[PDB]
C-alpha cells in the first residue's frame, strides 16, 4: 500500500539548509517552500530519514524499478537511495551527509509523480507535537 495524497498544503521545493550542534547530539535543519510562499523548519535525526526511504521503496515500487508500465506511458523509474550508514563519520563525511540530504529531499519534490506531495514525505516537512 502507498500513502494518501493530501488536498491541503502541497510543497513545491525541498532542500536542507545545514546541521548544528545540540547537547552533543547532531541535528539537521530541513527547509521547504510552498506555492503560497510558505516555509517550515524542523529538526530531526539521521534515522528519521532512513526510515522514510525504507517506506518509499515499498510505497512506490514502480519508481524503484520493480514493475513495467503498460506500454504507452513513459516515466523514469527513479528512487532515492541511501549512501549507507557510517560508524565514525568524520568532519568531511559530515559535510557530505548534510549535502546529500538536500538532494534526497529535493529529489522527492522533483519527482514526475505525486510523490512530491506524498503523505510520507510531507510528514517530514512538519512540526511533530512541537
Swiss-Prot record:
Q: Where are the transmembrane segments?
A: none
Residue span(s) of domain PX: 6-130
Where in the cell? Cytoplasm, Cytoskeleton
Q: What else is known?
A: Present with 6490 molecules/cell in log phase SD medium.
> Quaternary structure?
Interacts with AXL2 and BUD5.
Explain the purpose of this protein.
Answer: Necessary for cell polarization during vegetative growth. May link the cytoskeleton to morphogenic determinants on the cell surface.
Annotated protein name in UniProt = Bud emergence protein 1
What is the source species? Answer: Saccharomyces cerevisiae (strain ATCC 204508 / S288c) (Baker's yeast)
Gene, per the UniProt record: BEM1
Q: Which residues of the full protein are shown?
A: 273 to 402 of 551
